[PDB]
Structure formats: structure tokens, C-alpha cells
Amino acid sequence: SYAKKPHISALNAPQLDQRYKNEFTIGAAVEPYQLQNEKDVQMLKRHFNSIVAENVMKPISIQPEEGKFNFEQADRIVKFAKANGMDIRFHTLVWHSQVPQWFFLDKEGKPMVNETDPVKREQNKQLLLKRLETHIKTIVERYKDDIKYWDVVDEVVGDDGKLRNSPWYQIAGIDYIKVAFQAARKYGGDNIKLYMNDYNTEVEPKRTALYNLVKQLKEEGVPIDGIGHQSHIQIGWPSEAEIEKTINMFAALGLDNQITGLDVSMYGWPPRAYPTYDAIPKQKFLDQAARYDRLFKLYEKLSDKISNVTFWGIADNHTWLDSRADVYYDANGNVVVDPNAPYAKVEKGKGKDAPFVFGPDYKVKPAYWAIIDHK
Ligand SMILES: [Cl-]
Ligand SMILES: [Cl-]
Ligand SMILES: [Zn+2]
Ligand SMILES: [Zn+2]
Ligand SMILES: [Zn+2]
Ligand SMILES: [Zn+2]
Ligand SMILES: [Zn+2]
Ligand SMILES: [Zn+2]
Ligand SMILES: [Zn+2]
């Protein structure tokens, strides 16, 4: 939406959170160093009223060795949010990636997944669940008064629609999910809100598997308050109709919905990225702006079912999507971005994506104008 609207500094632009303040909070994912950068601080103060840590609250960042808790980085994000009246989301108590390996070693130091004795396997289950409870207990006892929203587990359902067969599941079975939510509620009390977070929540068979899993857990009294939809999406996928169907499906269970990691990639999958920001054609930003226009129109339509929309970053100069921005080169060394076209080599993660409404120079994109207006 719209091109005659100018490329002005985002620090001079109408505030994004204020535009949406009766519909949902507007969040950004951050690293501690961005809180030491004048531009990023001014962006967070101007446009956002919710915050989450990109990385410093993940299990391996918090407890890299058993008994060694590293809260200093997480504390800095909590401090900044309190000083600026921001909601905080905790990402994340449990995840199969970025996972300290000590969790899954038995008393003899051997991988628990390798045990064959059923009596010893049950001992490893109880030991892993005890470690899980202590991890969650320590974090929630520190932050329960400060952090309202918790990703209790991330990505526990596989893309094949079965439970993800991570070491958590191999060793402890489904109970690791139940234990995590129960521990968060026990040590955090009734006022913190507990979420199951995942990507491709719109895609079958994952969508209905997520639905059935959460429905069953709530029937058994496991405290789950909502679903986090990571929403790592593309310009043309998934459809707005399928997003709407997903959000309604989970709201029908009585669950809150949060959009927890929104980015709108310029590319498909696997991505064939441009090598630099400057090489991305202007038309891509117009296509992106129209996608954002439709997306936030839908979020507003469903505002009674969505409490928060968080972007997985601040401005286009920093996005984890760049780690996926593979650049394909033909035999003559020219960039290939056509997903079917011939090519000779790929430089993995060397390109540039552009997923936000704010450009890498902190000036507003067409996508910003598309979601700040009321059309
Ligand atoms: Cl990143
Ligand atoms: Cl620019
Ligand atoms: Zn308004
Ligand atoms: Zn504000
Ligand atoms: Zn450049
Ligand atoms: Zn709402
Ligand atoms: Zn980052
Ligand atoms: Zn610019
Ligand atoms: Zn609009």
C-alpha cells in the first residue's frame, strides 16, 4: 500500500504500538547489545510496548551447565522493559535446539537415549524431569513478578504431525510437556500466562496435531493459556484464509493467540536470496507492503482473539532470516533468484532478507505505511 508516502526516519513516524493499542500489543525481539545502541533504544521506546529476547533466555543461555545460572543478559532486557512500561515474553523454557547436553546424560555420563534397560530408562525419565523442574523453578522464581507471558515449550509437534522426537520426548515421553507447564504454574502462580509456541501452525498435519495435543492436555488439567504462532511467513504463503482458520480453531478451545515471531521474508523456501539489501528490487517492497496490509487487516478483524503481535526483530539491518538467505550463483557468477533456474554453487547464509516495516537505515518502508493507516 502506497508509494507517495515518504521514506522518513522511523523516529519521526506515528507510533506503531499506539495505532494498535486497543487491538493488541506490538512487540520486538532483541539482543542485549541493541539496548546499548541509541537508534534501537529510540525505536523500542517509540514503537513497541512488548519485548522478547531473541536468544539470551533460551535454555543454553540460562543454564549452560547444571547449577550455573546466567541471568545477567536476561536481567538487562527485563530492566529495560520495566523502565519503559513494556510487556515481557519469556522465550523459552523448553526447546529441542540450543539445548545444554548435560540435561540428557545419565548418572554415569552416558547419553540417556542409549539406555536399553526399562528400569534404568524410567530412572533417566524421572531424573530428566527433575532437572526440567529445577530449570523452570529457578527461572520462574526469579521473574514471576516481572514477565507476564511465557513460552513454556517451543516446537514440540513435528512437521509430520507427530510429536517431535527430540531427546526430551525420547527419554521422558509426553510427560515432559505436562511437567513443564505444571512447574511454570506451580512456581509462577495464577497470574502468568503459559503458551505453547510453534511455527507453521497453519500447516496440516501439524495444525490439527497441535490442536489435538493442546485439547487433550487441557482435558487432563495441564495449565495452558494460549498458542504462540511464530509466523515466519512469506509474501504469498500461508494464505490469509488459512491464518484466519488457524486462529479461530485455537480460540475455539478457549486459548489466547499471540503472534510471536512475525517476519515476512522476501523469498520462498528454500530461499534464493539477493546478495545485498541494495540488490532487492523495489517491486518486492510493494508486494511485501500489500501482504502486510492484508495481514494486519486480518489481525485486527481477529483482535478479540489476539493479545499480541511481536516481530522477530526491530529493523531490516538485523534479522535471523539472513542466516537462511542463501545466494545462488550460475556458471557465469551471476545471482540466481528464480527458484527453478539453473545454478552452479550456493553461498549459504550470505545474502540479505528484508522482513520488517522498518528499513536498515531506520526509515519506514511501504509496509509501514500499509499498516499504520486505517484502510
Ligand atoms: Cl539473529
Ligand atoms: Cl533503505
Ligand atoms: Zn486508529
Ligand atoms: Zn508506546
Ligand atoms: Zn549495500
Ligand atoms: Zn486483542
Ligand atoms: Zn539476532
Ligand atoms: Zn533508506
Ligand atoms: Zn492498511
* Three-state SS annotation for 267-313: CCCCCCCECCHHHCCHHHHHHHHHHHHHHHHHHHHCHHHEEEEEECC
Q: How far is the CA of 323 from the centre of ligand 1 (A)?
A: 8
Cα 356 to Cα 48: distance, rounded to the nearest angstrom: 13
Task: Name the amino acid, one letter, at 227.
Answer: I
In a domain, 295, yes or no: no
Backbone angles phi, psi at 68, to 5 degrees: -100, 105
Q: Which helix (H) or strand (E) holds 62?
A: helix 59-62
Range of the structural domain that residue 159 is part of? 22-270+301-315
In a domain, 108, yes or no: yes
Task: Map grid coordinates 512488548 to a residue.
Answer: 50
Write the CATH number for 244.
3.20.20.80
3-state SS of the chain: helix, strand, coil percent to 5? 40, 20, 40
Nearest CA-CA partner of 233 in 269, 204, 183, 257 = 269
Task: Name the amino acid, one letter, at 151.
Answer: D
Q: How far is the CA of 293 from the centre of ligand 9 (A)?
A: 4
Q: How far is the CA of 360 from the centre of ligand 8 (A)?
A: 7
Burial (0-12, 13-18, 19+ Cβ within 10 Å), 246: buried
List b or e across 152-163, with b for residues whose CB sees 16 or more CB atoms inside 10 angstroms.
bbbbbbbeeeeb
| Ligand in nearest proximity to the CA of 56 | 7
Q: How many CB atoms lie within 10 A of CB 204?
A: 11
Q: How many CB atoms lie within 10 A of CB 70?
A: 14
- What are the C-alpha distances in Å from 109 to residues 32, 36, 60, 102, 214? 34, 41, 18, 8, 34
Cα 143 to Cα 111: distance, rounded to the nearest angstrom: 31
Backbone angles phi, psi at 197, to 5 degrees: -115, 140
C-alpha cell at 129: 524431569
DSSP letter assigned to residue 373: S
217, 181 Cβ separation under 8 angstroms: yes
Cα 208 to Cα 230: distance, rounded to the nearest angstrom: 16
Task: Give the sign of the dihedral formed by CA 342, CA 325, CA 316, CA 365.
Answer: positive
Cα 130 → chain centroid: 27
SS3 labels along the chain: CCCCCCCCEHHHCCCHHHHCCCCCEEEEEECHHHHHCHHHHHHHHHHCCEEEECCCCCHHHHCCECCECCCHHHHHHHHHHHHCCCEEEECCCCCCCCCCHHHHECCCCCEHHHCCCHHHHHHHHHHHHHHHHHHHHHHHHHHCCCCCEEEEEECCECCCCCECCCHHHHHHCCHHHHHHHHHHHHHHCCCCEEEEEECCCCCCCHHHHHHHHHHHHHHCCCCCCEEEECCEECCCCCCHHHHHHHHHHHHCCCCEEEEEEEEECCCCCCCCCECCHHHCCHHHHHHHHHHHHHHHHHHHHCHHHEEEEEECCCCCCCCHHHHHCCEEECCCCCEECCCCCCCCEEECCCCECCCCCECCCCEECHHHHHHHCCC
Nearest CA-CA partner of 213 in 158, 137, 287 = 158
C-alpha cell at 170: 525420547
In a domain, 130, yes or no: yes
Nearest CA-CA partner of 51 in 85, 19, 98 = 85
In a domain, 336, yes or no: no
C-alpha cell at 173: 515421553
HSE-CB at 128 with a 13 A cutoff on CA atoms is 28
Nearest CA-CA partner of 366 in 310, 291, 313 = 291
Q: How far is the CA of 334 from the centre of ligand 5 (A)?
A: 17
In a domain, 322, yes or no: no
In a domain, 163, yes or no: yes
In a domain, 210, yes or no: yes
| Ligand in nearest proximity to the CA of 52 | 7
- Measured between its terminal Cα atoms, the distance across the chain in Å is 9
Q: How far is the CA of 133 from the centre of ligand 4 (A)?
A: 35
Burial (0-12, 13-18, 19+ Cβ within 10 Å), 102: middle
Cα 167 to Cα 177: distance, rounded to the nearest angstrom: 12
| Ligand in nearest proximity to the CA of 46 | 4
Nearest CA-CA partner of 306 in 243, 212, 264 = 243
363, 282 Cβ separation under 8 angstroms: no
Q: How far is the CA of 360 from the centre of ligand 2 (A)?
A: 6
Cα 89 to Cα 149: distance, rounded to the nearest angstrom: 5
Q: How far is the CA of 369 from the centre of ligand 9 (A)?
A: 7
Q: How far is the CA of 61 from the centre of ligand 7 (A)?
A: 14
Give the full edge-to-edge strand order of the sheet including 327-329: 335-336, 327-329, 345-347
Number of domains forming the structure of the chain? 1
Burial (0-12, 13-18, 19+ Cβ within 10 Å), 175: middle
Give bridge partners of residue 363 from the DSSP assignment.
9
Cα 240 to Cα 294: distance, rounded to the nearest angstrom: 7
- What are the C-alpha distances in Å from 202 to residues 177, 186, 229? 21, 31, 9
| Ligand in nearest proximity to the CA of 18 | 4
Task: Name the amino acid, one letter, at 164.
Answer: R
Burial (0-12, 13-18, 19+ Cβ within 10 Å), 235: middle
54, 77 Cβ separation under 8 angstroms: no
DSSP letter assigned to residue 198: E
Q: Near ion ligand 4, which residues have CB within 5 Å?
A: 17, 49
Experimental method: X-ray
DSSP letter assigned to residue 254: T
| Ligand in nearest proximity to the CA of 34 | 7
Q: How many CB atoms lie within 10 A of CB 339?
A: 12
In a domain, 44, yes or no: yes
Give bridge partners of residue 111 from the DSSP assignment.
105
Q: How far is the CA of 30 from the centre of ligand 7 (A)?
A: 7
Resolution in A: 2.0
Q: How far is the CA of 269 from the centre of ligand 6 (A)?
A: 31
Q: How far is the CA of 368 from the centre of ligand 9 (A)?
A: 9
